[PDB]
Design a protein around this ligand. Structure first.
Ligand code: ZN
Ligand code: ZN
Ligand code: ZN
Ligand code: ZN
Lengths: 103, 97
């Protein structure tokens, strides 16, 4: 039962585009611990460890080009509920329509 | 049996409101558009409300402002537009001409 294919393709399109905003800018992995970087960017926390662990001095924002340091970012938890909530939205889609989300 | 016969897109409707809460401005207490961070803690406001209170920061968390210039958040901005879509998907525009 694909909800009779009635306005089902439109929704799925909104669910995908939504995940993009709650995606990852380095490993492309659904961020869990959203942290704001010196460049007002989000990350998965651990991503910063590697970016800073690298023997290259201050981290380099891969979103723009650079501008990042250890004593800068901080777990603010702004894009947390946005990621967790979104996940629950996709579950409901397949629960009823049962259409594919992404692979 | 049902108010509008099945209706469908019921569970999706509840999801929209949920995500909206994460976008709902603190000052305007409603959906925003192309807002600004500032709330280094966990608060967020539009790009035309916080500007009148940047000297301090957040009106709730009382956290000091982190951005001197009225920056923008393309992420949260795109999230609003997307949420608007789902709103129409649930409403379903029934009209030919
Ligand atoms: Zn990551
Ligand atoms: Zn950047
Ligand atoms: Zn506002
Ligand atoms: Zn706050």
């Amino acid at each position: 039962m694909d909800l009779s294919a009635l306005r089902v393709e439109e929704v799925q399109n909104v669910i995908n585009a939504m995940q993009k905003i709650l995606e990852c800018p380095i490993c492309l992995e659904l961020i869990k611990e959203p942290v704001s970087t010196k460049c007002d960017h989000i990350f998965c926390k651990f991503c910063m460890l590697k970016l800073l662990n690298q023997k290259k001095g201050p981290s380099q924002c891969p979103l723009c080009k650079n501008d990042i340091t250890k004593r800068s970012l901080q777990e603010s938890t702004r894009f947390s509920q946005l990621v967790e909530e979104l996940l629950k939205i996709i579950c409901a889609f397949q629960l009823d329509t049962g259409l594919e989300y992404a692979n | 049996m049902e108010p509008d016969g099945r209706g469908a897109w019921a569970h999706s409707r509840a999801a929209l409101d949920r995500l909206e809460k994460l976008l709902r401005c603190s000052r305007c207490t409603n959906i925003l558009r192309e807002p600004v961070c500032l709330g280094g803690c966990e608060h967020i406001f539009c790009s035309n409300c916080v500007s009148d209170c940047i000297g301090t920061g957040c009106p709730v968390c009382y956290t000091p402002a982190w951005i001197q210039d009225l920056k923008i958040n393309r992420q949260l901005d795109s999230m609003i537009q997307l949420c608007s879509k789902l709103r129409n998907l649930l409403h379903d525009n029934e009209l030919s001409d």
